[PDB]
Symmetry: C4
Subunit: 439 residues, 4 copies
Amino acid sequence: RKLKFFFMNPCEKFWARGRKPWKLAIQILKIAMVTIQLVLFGLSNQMVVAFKEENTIAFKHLFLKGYMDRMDDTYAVYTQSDVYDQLIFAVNQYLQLYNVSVGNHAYENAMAICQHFYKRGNIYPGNDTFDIDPEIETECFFVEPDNKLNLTLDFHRLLTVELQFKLKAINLQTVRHQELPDCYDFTLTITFDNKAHSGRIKISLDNDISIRECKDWHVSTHYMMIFDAFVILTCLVSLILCIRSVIRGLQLQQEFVGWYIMIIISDILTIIGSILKMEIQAKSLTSYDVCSILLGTSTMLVWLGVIRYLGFFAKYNLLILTLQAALPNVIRFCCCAAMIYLGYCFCGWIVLGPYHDKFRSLNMVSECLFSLINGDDMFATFAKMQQKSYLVWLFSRIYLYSFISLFIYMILSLFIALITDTYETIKQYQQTELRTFIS
Amino acid sequence: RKLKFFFMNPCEKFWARGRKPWKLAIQILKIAMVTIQLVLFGLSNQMVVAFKEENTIAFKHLFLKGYMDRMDDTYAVYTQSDVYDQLIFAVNQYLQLYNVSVGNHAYENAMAICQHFYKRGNIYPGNDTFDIDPEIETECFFVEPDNKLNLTLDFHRLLTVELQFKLKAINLQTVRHQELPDCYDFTLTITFDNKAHSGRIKISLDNDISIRECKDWHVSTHYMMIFDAFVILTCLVSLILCIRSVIRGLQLQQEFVGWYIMIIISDILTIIGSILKMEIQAKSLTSYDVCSILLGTSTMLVWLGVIRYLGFFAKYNLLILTLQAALPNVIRFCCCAAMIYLGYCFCGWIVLGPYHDKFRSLNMVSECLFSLINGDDMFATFAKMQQKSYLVWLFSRIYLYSFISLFIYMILSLFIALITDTYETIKQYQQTELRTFIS
Amino acid sequence: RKLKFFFMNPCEKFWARGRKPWKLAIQILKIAMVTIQLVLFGLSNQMVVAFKEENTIAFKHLFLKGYMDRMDDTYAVYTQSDVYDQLIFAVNQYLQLYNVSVGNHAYENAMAICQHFYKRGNIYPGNDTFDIDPEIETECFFVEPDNKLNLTLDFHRLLTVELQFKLKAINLQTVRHQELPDCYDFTLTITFDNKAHSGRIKISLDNDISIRECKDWHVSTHYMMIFDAFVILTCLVSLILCIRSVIRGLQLQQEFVGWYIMIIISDILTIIGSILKMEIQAKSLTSYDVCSILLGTSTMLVWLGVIRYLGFFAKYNLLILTLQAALPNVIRFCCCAAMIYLGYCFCGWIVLGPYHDKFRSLNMVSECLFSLINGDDMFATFAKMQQKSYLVWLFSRIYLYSFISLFIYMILSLFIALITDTYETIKQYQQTELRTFIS
Amino acid sequence: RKLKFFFMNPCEKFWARGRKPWKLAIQILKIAMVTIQLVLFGLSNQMVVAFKEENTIAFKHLFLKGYMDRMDDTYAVYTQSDVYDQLIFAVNQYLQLYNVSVGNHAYENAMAICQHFYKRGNIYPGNDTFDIDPEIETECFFVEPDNKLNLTLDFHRLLTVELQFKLKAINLQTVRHQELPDCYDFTLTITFDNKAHSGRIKISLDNDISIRECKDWHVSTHYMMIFDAFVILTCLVSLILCIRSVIRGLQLQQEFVGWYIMIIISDILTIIGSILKMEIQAKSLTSYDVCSILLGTSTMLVWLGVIRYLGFFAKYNLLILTLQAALPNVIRFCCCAAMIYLGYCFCGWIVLGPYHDKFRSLNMVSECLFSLINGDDMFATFAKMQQKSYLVWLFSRIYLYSFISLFIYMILSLFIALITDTYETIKQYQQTELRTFIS
């Protein structure tokens, strides 16, 4: 009836009729609004972030006694004078920060160093006897920021050492031009671990940074926040056009008795996103990155909306029409064969993985498999050579060609395949009783 | 009629008839002429260029106080004695250039250093108060090239420092053998920026170089320039064979009431190219690289002419026949799905991009997406580890496999697909009323 | 008959009938049991291993007199004072280990250095005469671990030098938390070879490590070993469900007069695997890595069982149905064309391989061919430039494009092809007299 | 007739008949003979070679005054004291070689240094006047190997400096175990060039090495050379079975009024190869690498013979049957589109190539295009940033996506395509009047 025309209607044919074109322009407003919300937001998150990393990487630059000819820090002390060396350099770094550090960041009214010790240790190499107590007692030591350093350390008993402290910084180019909180204290922990007891104590400096606003600001009702609330009003108006889409879906359920479900799921993530960016505006958390992930999932789904827009012009939408069509054999293939993947990762995992990486995480082995699926890594995998067991390397070539095998021969092809097939029927059926009664 | 034979005529069948073969040989002359114009020109642009870069990279070699074990310069001072160190080294570099610099380049009748300052600064860490004035006053200082150095710098207030100066060089192996202007003054600016205020002041030396001809030259009517004017006469004769092609197209419009449109668009870019290389011959600009881009677009289109030449021999031109044929689904797919691309770049852009690069430009994120589209970068993207939020890295794997997913499963396949299909109908229809009335 | 129903029966349709569902749950128990056996085992092998490598890499860190700006150790002495330098550093390393080495590892009641000499040497450069005796006499020297060093070396006559020694270490974080032997003596051999007589004596330190259990342990009937025996009882129960599968196959041979053959081959490798992990539990070998390879082949085949499980749900198993189907043209193509591969490796091998690598192993040349098959290495292969013979580099480009050619044009395509075809008949025959008599 | 049966006969069906099986076993003998000739030969060429490179790389190790934190030597002096520094180090290297050099290689009854000078130079920066004389006079200086060094150099006038000398080495592990000439004098030339006059004088050491046999040898009718003559007799017997194949082809021309043409072209390259390895056995050239290329082309074609062997077993040879079949559209596509390639390289060549590489060779630009065709290099191409002209980088992204575009969208697809099609008719016609009259 007329209901079937309002429902099976064409946006562009709806342009022929009057007083319909208002909804689309509303929706494009939502498009570029959300788009800007991205834009401006991305300045926001990245500027914040990069300042943190900047300041971050540098804190290593002040407090690590040295850096090498290789940029990579993965390397750490062999020496006793090395550790007491890093301690002198860094405690005196606490001291000499006011003078030497070229950054503004200064002490706020303070440091500390933790050392973790073994409850009852015993080592007897002579009789081979080895006695351990699985209890660690942590002694914490406190630094006052302004000279002599007293160090008590026993080498065999050392599992982990750390130091903690938190230094203040207020970001000038951040609060100067735009609105984001200018203070974040970077709470630093530098660490040296014998955790494995091997003779190399693996040193890394790691900083967590917390966002706080200046107690006062005097420089030289925020329209950008009220704009995010007005784009948020665009998003609630979009969840209201998603509520008119939802009553449209309720009317399509009554008549049935979704492109919008995407559109509404979007501006719901955008709505929860706008509320939540209001929320990290209130909280000042600095781990609100999530609020970012939340916010951007929206950007995504809204741009599949960019998909049904261009699809809206041409109207035969074959690219997303065939893709949609055979997604069944697609997902069935992914989750079914992805098992085969898993198993190989395991095989690589118990035999190969000892050999692969110094981090030697199965996660990494999974990743570098899929790396060869991407065509690279053969070069760094083939390169590092077993040579201990001719059987070891022998299997090594056996599987790596086996799997690198089963996908090129097998993986792309099934893909390429069902892809081909439903392209065919797409073009074919382009060239139902429900539509018949609709006619 | 006879008009249809002159029009639907075969170049090689035209060889059977007499006094026709002159136009093609004219056109091959244009082929290898333009080809040479490339050749000789490429010597020209590259020799110039490489000299600039040579001299360039080296200027960093003189005036940067140091270089590291890592080739990469991205790194910069942590220290106050470091900056005054780079200043001493470089001002004394100005001084000691005559003696120490192994290059010819010398002062011409002179340097300077700029420092940009804050209008009204205030920093109060104790009460958390932070006061800034968004106005920068630049003080410029002048160097006379032949000893004492006085430095006035305040650390908190420092946003950017620079130095400028322009040194003279006349390129020997350039003007010696061939004709290109031998003098280019490289106007240098070395810089140290606290622009972010982080504690690392990011140092880079950057040179713009300007081309000028020696006022006099005595060594030991230019035929190479008149050759470029004669190949330019070949190009105007080609725009005249493109005007005979255009009156040929006017006759084909009258009869219709283009391979040439390419041929003429080419030798028009080649003609504007020959005029413009005459033009940077007059101007001596050194940013005439554009004149190069202009010039070479020609090389391009003329070699798609190389395409209809070999196609001219075989005459069934299926490779460019099928490609042409289905370019519709091709461009429709590119610009339609390329949306999907865009959206992902955004998603990566707000959540992932904080994490990806120290430059952290969305441009770069776009680039390294398409990098995985090329099969590499999985290795450097998978490698650098979030580890702050299990949700952060969690999404990280979610999308990177999601998109790396949608294209391998989706991207090549649609491609491979329409490509297959129109190959089929190409071979098929190989194996119209207009042609019928032509018969 | 009824026999044909028990045989051509559906697991999920068997769920409709009663007292059948017990066998599957038995088999899933075997799934996640074996899965855990992996899990726990993988902790085991990797923790052991990584400790060895840790301690390992570091031993180089103590005893190599130096490390460079490049991480790579491939480089070695040019000097006489260099070798006597490495000797001083390392013999004094033996000495100063107790004091300087930050690892626990200590001497156990001792080192030695071997030098291999020429039987009768003669070198006469003046008259060009060159006399050699193909007999090497090895003199071994012994180190007592607690000062003066006397060195006797002749440069021309030096083929290989080594030193051997074995140091004791008991791994704390290994025996502390879980059960694995805590002592492994790393028997070290550091070496300097003039083996080629070139003027660079290629230095590497290499360690073999042997596992031994502490003679006594006092800390602060193993259920994990009895769990591996109980999962081993799961595996024997699985070889007994593989014996019921085998009597099932004997009944299917009688009726015929295998998915299980995989299932049983698996839990046989898992059974020999469980017995053998019991066996390296008895032996304490440290080259039991094989026992790992043995053990994991199981993980593999059992997860192709994960394949017939998900396949068990959907029941039309097309992904493994088409793959199975045309594996004939697959294996025929692999082993047939893989000849063509071989030949190219040879061609590259005699002409190209001189040029390719400093290790210059044909194995490596084979590997980096298949590397370009993976899309990478063009960059490091194209980069290193012949330039001695224009014919040398000329062929160099000839073949590398020739083969890189024959596979892209040829290799993926045949692949993609038969893959396509049997996908078609898979979908077709989805859309026998034996089955007819079964009906 | 019977002639058609001897001709259209099956090797394996010929096994049914008697006294035929002798020819094949002859031919397999040729297979593994030639195979061994490879084998042994490959030892030969590689061992020689690697010794040369060994000794080679090291000569740089003695005579370059320094090496850096970066392995790459591409870098060279900025300084006057640097060049006189390299001279001292290297002339004194000539001196101190007997003592310091850990290699055997010694002087044979001597060095020299060349400096190339400008005929009439004039530099006038003040008035901008620049005068040059395009004539270089080379002064050569001679070194006697056993102390004071006198240096005469003018900086502006310096185009190129070199030094030459040739040092003797007799390769121990080469002549000791097997037969190859043990002496090769490595004639060295180290060089420093201001060739561009830029202020960095690009230093490289380059060695040509010549093979000579020891005048006498006393150690502790060659069967390996007579084996290469006997495998060469296998090759002449193979050119005689290729002459029986050629009279077989003459009989097939008479009956017609080639697999063998390959077989004979092979053992002709193998025959000329065996004669020529006899020939570099006589000549002792050391640039006989060609003799290697000659020799191995054989290995190649003989292993396409490995192709018709396995094809000989199965007998339906579809993999090489379809490949053969549509090679027409294949080669037509390669040489036709490869034009399109060329043109792009040019476009990249005049505009992009200034920017790409410091070597900035169009050859390299061609190579790295085809690199992206291989899926890598996007990372190093996208990375290095124009930033001088927004138009420069703008086109930069324009084309790199344009071409990276036209092949993925276009290149593999046509490929994948004709490959698919003739696979189809291969399988089809598997599932002529000449054969009919043969029947």
